Amino acid sequence: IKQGIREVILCKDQDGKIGLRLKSIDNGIFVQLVQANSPASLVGLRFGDQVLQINGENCAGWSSDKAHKVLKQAFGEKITMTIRDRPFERTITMHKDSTGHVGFIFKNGKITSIVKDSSAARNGLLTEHNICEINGQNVIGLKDSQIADILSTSGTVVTITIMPAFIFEHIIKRMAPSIMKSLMDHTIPEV
Ligand SMILES: CN(C)S(=O)(=O)N1CCOCC1
């Protein structure tokens, strides 16, 4: 999680889409969805990113509706955004033991127990936290089985990016569970 603000320059695709849904939280605007193969994914926007400015207008106080309207009404040859990097999230680094375990249990992407004497206990992993990313890959809307698969196939170093469940549950409200599964960019980014 970068400790600062960054500018991204965006470009509506042939269909006038950028591949983004935005959400009002605590009078800010946050990324709810980044669509696979979109302008939003190619510039590196991420779930949980805060949008500070669009085209140098401040977002503070906007409804989700107004942010979506502003995006639509933009002469989008070049859209600038000022982004604060996933402010509600933290990254934890853990090491599999020789049985291949980092040492927790999750349900619906939510960590529910930490196993004593584990890398997850040693690194202070918390329960009541949703898994946003593993090893730089967005996992939101994957089945629990597919998240366990990704951990299985990871090298011994496992990076997990987590969010307080209450904040997570507030961000994904009014987004159907199959849009998250179908359309949320789960890919490794392109270079
Ligand atoms: C209970 N399931 C959906 S599971 O067996 O597929 N499971 C494996 C262990 O981590 C959590 C997910």
Swiss-Prot record:
Changing residue 108 to D: Disruption of the cooperative binding of C-terminal peptides from FZD7 and phosphatidylinositol-4,5-bisphosphate. A 1,2-diacyl-sn-glycero-3-phospho-(1D-myo-inositol-4,5-bisphosphate) binds at residues 108, 143-144. Changing residue 107 to A: Disruption of the cooperative binding of C-terminal peptides from FZD7 and phosphatidylinositol-4,5-bisphosphate. GO terms for cellular component: adherens junction; azurophil granule lumen; blood microparticle; cytoplasm; cytoskeleton; cytosol; endoplasmic reticulum membrane; extracellular exosome. The keyword Metal-binding does not apply. It is a peripheral membrane protein. Transmembrane segments: none annotated. Expressed in lung cancers, including adenocarcinoma, squamous cell carcinoma and small-cell carcinoma (at protein level). Widely expressed. Expressed in fetal kidney, liver, lung and brain. In adult highest expression in heart and placenta. Induction: By IFNG/IFN-gamma in melanoma cells. GO terms for molecular function: cytoskeletal anchor activity; frizzled binding; identical protein binding; interleukin-5 receptor binding; phosphatidylinositol-4,5-bisphosphate binding; protein heterodimerization activity; protein sequestering activity; syndecan binding. Residues 7-86, 91-166 form the PDZ domain. One of its GO terms (biological process) is positive regulation of phosphorylation. It is found in: Cell junction, Focal adhesion; Cell junction, Adherens junction; Cell membrane; Endoplasmic reticulum membrane. Keywords: Acetylation, Cell junction, Cell membrane, Cytoplasm, Cytoskeleton, Endoplasmic reticulum, Lipid-binding, Membrane, Nucleus, Phosphoprotein, Repeat, Secreted. Phosphorylated on tyrosine residues. Monomer and homodimer. Interacts with SDC1, SDC2, SDC3, SDC4, NRXN2, EPHA7, EPHB1, NF2 isoform 1, TGFA and IL5RA. Interacts with NFASC and PTPRJ. Interacts with SDCBP2. Interacts with PDCD6IP. Forms a complex with PDCD6IP and SDC2. Interacts (via C-terminus) with TGFBR1. Binds to FZD7; this interaction is increased by inositol trisphosphate (IP3). Interacts with SMO. Multifunctional adapter protein involved in diverse array of functions including trafficking of transmembrane proteins, neuro and immunomodulation, exosome biogenesis, and tumorigenesis. Positively regulates TGFB1-mediated SMAD2/3 activation and TGFB1-induced epithelial-to-mesenchymal transition (EMT) and cell migration in various cell types. May increase TGFB1 signaling by enhancing cell-surface expression of TGFR1 by preventing the interaction between TGFR1 and CAV1 and subsequent CAV1-dependent internalization and degradation of TGFR1. This is Syntenin-1. It comes from Homo sapiens. The lineage of its organism: Eukaryota, Metazoa, Chordata, Craniata, Vertebrata. The gene is SDCBP. The chain holds residues 108 to 298 of 298 of the full protein.
